[PDB]
Write a protein that binds this ligand. Structure first.
Ligand SMILES: CC(C)CCC[C@@H](C)[C@H]1CC[C@H]2[C@@H]3CC=C4C[C@@H](O)CC[C@]4(C)[C@H]3CC[C@]12C
Lengths: 223, 57, 342, 231, 281
């Protein structure tokens, strides 16, 4: 009941849907990761190891990753954070060596405590209820050096643990994971990275694969 | 001297906004009510058209 | 000393403006429009469902022929729809998938879009090569692009999250005018029918009226309690409506320079994403976070009807130039075309 | 620039086979439907075959159906026409024509230069074979159809072409009123039902040529006899 | 005598639990969930299929209350009798597809809808085939139904019932093959990924997969294992006392098969943490 050109227009629309279906299949097989953290916290170093939004594409063991860096945006975070609802995981970078430092802009706020409030809002955000977090604790080698001079008591007044590197490193990890107010819906994967580390990509793949499998187990209804 | 420079600009802007002519709300309200009345018949969403004249049958 | 004295003078000017607005608030729009009959119940059916977007739809805009429309989704696809047949006329792959706004040129020869990439990209729809190509990328904003509107084939106005709006010369790619004065992220803009003025709503809960040619702010409208997400001019250009996160819509008048009416309900506790008027301006259609679109009586502040056809946020809506139908886009990846029946 | 070059034509024996090629450059070939149109010497245009974008739909004229095969190679941007059992009735210049179909598109907008082959249904009527004209004077050309070309969707699928001496046809008016890109505004198309008129205000030297009216309401596409303008 | 009392008590519990469980499961799959996965499509049909099986119980329950007297029409009971078995074998076929689908996604929405539609249409043909074969072959006693009938003169009907039992073990082989592979695959993953924030999920899900296999095995295997004897009893001629034993044994094992109808909604609620949080909310 269509004209000659109308039947040709419908055929054009059907071809567009075929191309849209193919692009949707290709995009659904790519891992999307939202990269967060504070300024000068090792985030830039992570990208190397792996004016708006910077996207990085890389492939590791037949798996395509998309990493979104939004640290260059100074706008209101609540006006664009819902656009990343649905990423596979959030890569959060925290600088361990910045425990005794003070935020440059505020000049009276502890740098480590500034990351906790940023981590607390992201982890407890309503748009990332079911999104896992890959917590990277950077600058572990520099953190050990600062331990000898500046003890952890400056960062945490209520810290009765020893001043050894292993005890100090583990205590910081526990505090961040204790900010997770939903320990069942989401999981936090903690890794200690460094400038010379080369296994950071492997941990991302292991953590992403763990997230993907546990997503299927929810689809299958067995978990 | 960044704050003092911004203060001068903000004060200067408020002078321009404070010197405009304002009509009464009743006068402004009447114009909106008048415009809606005049174009009521040619509004398909307000008064749905017959199915013969509806492109979205 | 000097700073303290100057900031005291600003408060005096604000009190002068507030007294001036109160002086001309002789009556209320509600009292004026009390006698007129209500519009009744507005029943609209889904005539068309546009399928093919595979992600959240963030923006849509009708063409001036009232038949073609462009929608933007964060699957990285700009789609132009034939609303009569639901045929896809074009599918434009976006270089950056984080699109937040889209605009259809009044001539129909161009479309524009932009998002978190801080760029407004212009696409030429009428090429001898038979494909849509990027004709211009407007760089210069330091925040995300929240809204864009063509004045003609050569001029476009964009609002950004860096608290500024800009007027662009598309041929040269340079911003001829920069509109500064908002203290928060500007989330939306609407052009006046004569395209000589435009209103913008920001996250400082204020709406400013800007002169396109002169390039300064003429008037500032306050009254919202949270970020303004949507704004739309009245069809005659003498008023505009805003939508905020405080679950309220307010109708401001340009000439009275103050708020005239508030559109809120006790059940509504969600933010507003988009607002539009019917052709006569009697109906105000607003999209909400609660998955619904509420049709308001603009004059009487009565909820005339509800468009409930989406399973996620209604992110955008628009009414055709002839007023025949209204399209609603949503985060559930579908577009629907609505109108009533006799 | 948009180019369509045909090759493979030449003198062939009756009952033989020949392969015509159409190489496309300067436009998205895979997005365009393609037509073959032939023109017998000292005769009008005759549509031969059509292949749609994506190769999903193929149509043939009755006089060639079963003997001609049309195919395309999208990666190579080449259009093919395989011909078999060639008759003396097939001696014509074969034109490669692009046509894209969407709302508001202009099909038949670009024609190829054509290749010459030599072998050893709505009726469109243009009764006026020739019209003596003078420069600067307004000329009207009439076309008639056996069936109404107005469809229920509001379109009237009538096209106007101009074939200047020695040149390929060019699109002037598509869907009976719209003016093709690159055509001066002096051309105007007016019609109703089965009767159509092409008005040429302020005729110039370039406008001299043969004018063809084509229907696109349904296949097979048929051309009018043609009206020649002479000084 | 004694059997009828047990059947009335046994089917009463299943009817109450099955109706409540499936109606709640149909509210979650339709009201709470607006978009459904491939697995949720199958479970949507299983709940519908089990609900129709639940509605067949009151006809059988009323039969036992009246001391094995069926006052209703002979045509009605044959429709009711076959409808009960139609829904039971729809569940078995669909549960075979669920296990196959779960195997792929651990070791596509358009396909699931077509498969569910095909299964219902294909099963409806068998429902008509049984009705046509039973009614047209010969007259039946209208005083009572759901009883034991010799089918030596209706071997065509018995052959069709034999085919269904054969296809069951082919389907049951797939369920055993899939869930064992799913369980073993998750167990070995839990060993490799023991150094992770939550490695117990791969151990709980491996246990959950085995429970589905056990529930399916307990409910359906004893009935179909003994069904071969039931079919052979109908064809061959045996003692009249042996016939009652076959009838009593098969009728009791049919109750156990009916227990899976009310255990499907319960099984899905507890294993999926999403529903549990929704249920608590
Ligand atoms: C034969 C008499 C006694 C019973 C009637 C059968 C009814 C209940 C059956 C037959 C076919 C079935 C449908 C088959 C396919 C689908 C598609 C699926 O996506 C949702 C369920 C749905 C829609 C089924 C619902 C139940 C259904 C309508």
């Amino acid at each position: 009941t269509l004209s000659a050109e109308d039947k040709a227009a419908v055929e054009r629309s059907k071809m567009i849907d075929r191309n849209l279906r193919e692009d949707g299949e290709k995009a659904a097989r790519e891992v999307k990761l939202l990269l967060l953290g504070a300024g000068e916290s090792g985030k830039n170093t992570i990208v190397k190891q792996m004016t708006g939004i910077v996207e990085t594409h890389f492939t590791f063991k037949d798996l395509h990753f998309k990493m979104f860096d939004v640290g260059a945006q100074r706008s209101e975070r609540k006006k664009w954070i819902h656009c990343f609802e649905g990423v596979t995981a959030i890569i959060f970078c925290v600088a361990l060596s910045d425990y005794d430092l003070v935020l440059a802009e505020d000049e009276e706020m502890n740098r480590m405590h500034a990351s906790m409030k940023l981590f607390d809002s992201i982890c407890n955000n309503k748009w990332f209820t079911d999104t896992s977090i890959i917590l990277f604790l950077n600058k572990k080698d520099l953190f050990e050096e600062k331990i000898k001079k500046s003890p952890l008591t400056i960062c945490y007044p209520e810290y009765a643990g020893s001043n050894t590197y292993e005890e100090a490193a583990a205590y910081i990890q526990c505090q961040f994971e204790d900010l997770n107010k939903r320990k069942d819906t989401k999981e936090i994967y903690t890794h200690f990275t460094c400038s010379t580390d080369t296994k950071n990509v492997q941990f991302v793949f292991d953590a992403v694969t763990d997230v993907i499998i546990k997503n299927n187990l929810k689809d299958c209804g067995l978990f | 001297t960044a704050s003092i420079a911004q203060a001068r600009k903000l004060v200067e802007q408020l002078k321009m906004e404070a010197n405009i002519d304002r009509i009464k709300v009743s006068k402004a309200a009447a114009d909106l009510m008048a415009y809606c009345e005049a174009h009521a018949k040619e509004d398909p969403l307000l008064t749905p058209v017959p199915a013969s004249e509806n492109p979205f049958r | 000393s000097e700073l303290d004295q100057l900031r005291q003078e600003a408060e005096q000017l604000k009190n002068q403006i507030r007294d001036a607005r109160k002086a001309c608030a002789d009556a209320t729009l509600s009292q004026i429009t009390n006698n007129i009959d209500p519009v009744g119940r507005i029943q609209m059916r889904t005539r068309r469902t546009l399928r093919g977007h595979l992600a959240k739809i963030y923006a849509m805009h009708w063409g001036t022929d009232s038949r073609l429309l462009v929608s933007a989704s964060q699957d990285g696809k700009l789609i132009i729809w034939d609303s009569y047949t639901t045929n896809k006329v074009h599918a434009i792959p976006l270089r950056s998938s984080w699109v937040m706004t889209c605009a259809y040129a009044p001539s129909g020869n161009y479309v524009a879009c932009g998002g978190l990439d801080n760029i407004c990209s212009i696409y030429n729809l009428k090429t001898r090569e038979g494909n849509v190509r990027v004709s211009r990328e407007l760089a210069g904003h330091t925040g995300y692009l929240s809204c864009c509107r063509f004045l003609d084939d050569n001029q476009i106005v964009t609002s950004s999250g860096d608290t500024t709006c800009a007027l662009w010369d598309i041929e040269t790619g340079q911003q001829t005018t920069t509109f500064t004065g908002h203290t928060g992220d500007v989330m939306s803009l609407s052009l006046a029918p004569d395209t000589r003025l435009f209103v913008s709503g920001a996250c400082d809960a204020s709406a400013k009226l800007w002169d396109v040619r002169e390039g300064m702010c003429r008037q500032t409208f306050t009254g919202h309690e949270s970020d303004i997400n949507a704004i739309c001019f009245f069809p005659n250009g003498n008023a505009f409506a805003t939508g905020s996160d405080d679950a309220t819509c307010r109708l401001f008048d340009l000439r009275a320079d103050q708020e005239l009416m508030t559109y809120s309900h006790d059940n509504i506790i969600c933010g507003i994403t988009s607002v539009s008027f019917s052709k006569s301006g009697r109906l105000l259609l607003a999209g909400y976070d609660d998955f619904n679109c509420n049709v308001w009586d603009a004059l009487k502040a009565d909820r005339a009807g509800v468009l409930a056809g989406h399973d996620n946020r209604v992110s955008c809506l628009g009414v055709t130039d002839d007023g025949m139908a209204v399209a609603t886009g949503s985060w559930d990846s579908f577009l629907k075309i609505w109108n009533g029946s006799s | 620039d948009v180019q369509l070059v045909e090759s493979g034509g030449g003198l062939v024996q009756p009952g033989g086979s020949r392969k015509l090629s159409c190489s496309a450059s300067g436009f998205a070939f895979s997005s365009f439907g393609m037509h073959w149109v032939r023109q017998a010497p000292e005769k009008g245009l005759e549509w031969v075959a059509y292949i749609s974008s994506g190769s999903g739909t193929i149509y043939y004229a009755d006089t060639v159906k079963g003997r001609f095969t049309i195919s395309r190679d999208d990666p190579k941007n080449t259009l093919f026409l395989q011909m078999t059992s060639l008759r003396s009735e097939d001696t014509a210049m074969y034109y490669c024509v692009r046509s894209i179909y969407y709302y508001g598109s202009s099909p038949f907008d670009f024609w190829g230069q054509g290749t010459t082959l030599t072998v050893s249904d709505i009726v469109m009527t243009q009764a006026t074979s020739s019209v003596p004209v003078t420069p600067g004077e307004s000329v009207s050309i009439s076309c008639r159809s056996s069936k109404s070309l107005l469809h229920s969707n509001g379109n009237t699928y009538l096209y106007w072409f101009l074939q200047r001496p020695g040149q390929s046809p060019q699109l002037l008016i598509y869907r009976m009123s719209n003016l093709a890109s690159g055509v001066p505004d002096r051309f105007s198309g007016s019609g109703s039902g089965t009767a159509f008129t092409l008005t040429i205000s302020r005729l110039e030297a370039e406008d001299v040529g043969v004018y063809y009216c084509m229907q696109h309401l349904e296949y097979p596409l048929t051309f009018g006899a043609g009206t020649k303008l002479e000084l | 005598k004694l059997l009828s009392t047990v059947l009335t008590t046994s089917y009463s519990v299943i009817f109450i639990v099955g109706l409540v469980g499936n109606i709640i499961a149909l509210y979650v799959f339709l009201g709470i969930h607006r978009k459904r996965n491939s697995i949720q499509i199958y479970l949507l049909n299983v709940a519908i299929a089990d609900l129709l099986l639940i509605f067949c119980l009151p006809f059988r329950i009323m039969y036992h209350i009246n001391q094995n007297k069926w006052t209703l029409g002979v045509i009605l009971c044959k429709v009711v009798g076959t409808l009960f078995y139609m829904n039971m074998y729809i569940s078995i076929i669909l549960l075979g597809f669920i296990s196959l689908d779960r195997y792929i996604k651990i070791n596509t929405t358009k396909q699931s809808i077509y498969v569910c539609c095909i299964v219902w249409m294909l099963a409806l043909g068998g429902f008509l085939t049984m009705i046509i074969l039973t009614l047209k072959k010969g007259g039946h006693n209208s005083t009572m139904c759901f009883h034991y009938r010799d089918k030596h003169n209706a071997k065509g009907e018995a052959i069709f019932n034999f085919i269904l039992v054969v296809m069951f073990w082919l389907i049951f082989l797939l369920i055993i093959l899939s869930y064992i592979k799913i369980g073993k695959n998750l167990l070995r993953i839990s060993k490799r990924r023991s150094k992770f924030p939550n490695s117990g999920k791969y151990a709980t899900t491996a246990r959950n997969s085995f429970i589905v296999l056990i529930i399916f095995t307990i409910c359906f295997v004893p009935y179909h294992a003994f069904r071969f004897i039931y079919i052979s009893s109908q064809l061959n001629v045996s003692s009249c006392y042996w016939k009652e034993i076959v009838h009593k044994t098969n009728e009791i094992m049919l109750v156990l098969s009916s227990f899976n109808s009310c255990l499907d909604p319960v099984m899905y609620f507890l294993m999926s943490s999403n529903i549990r949080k929704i249920m608590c909310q």
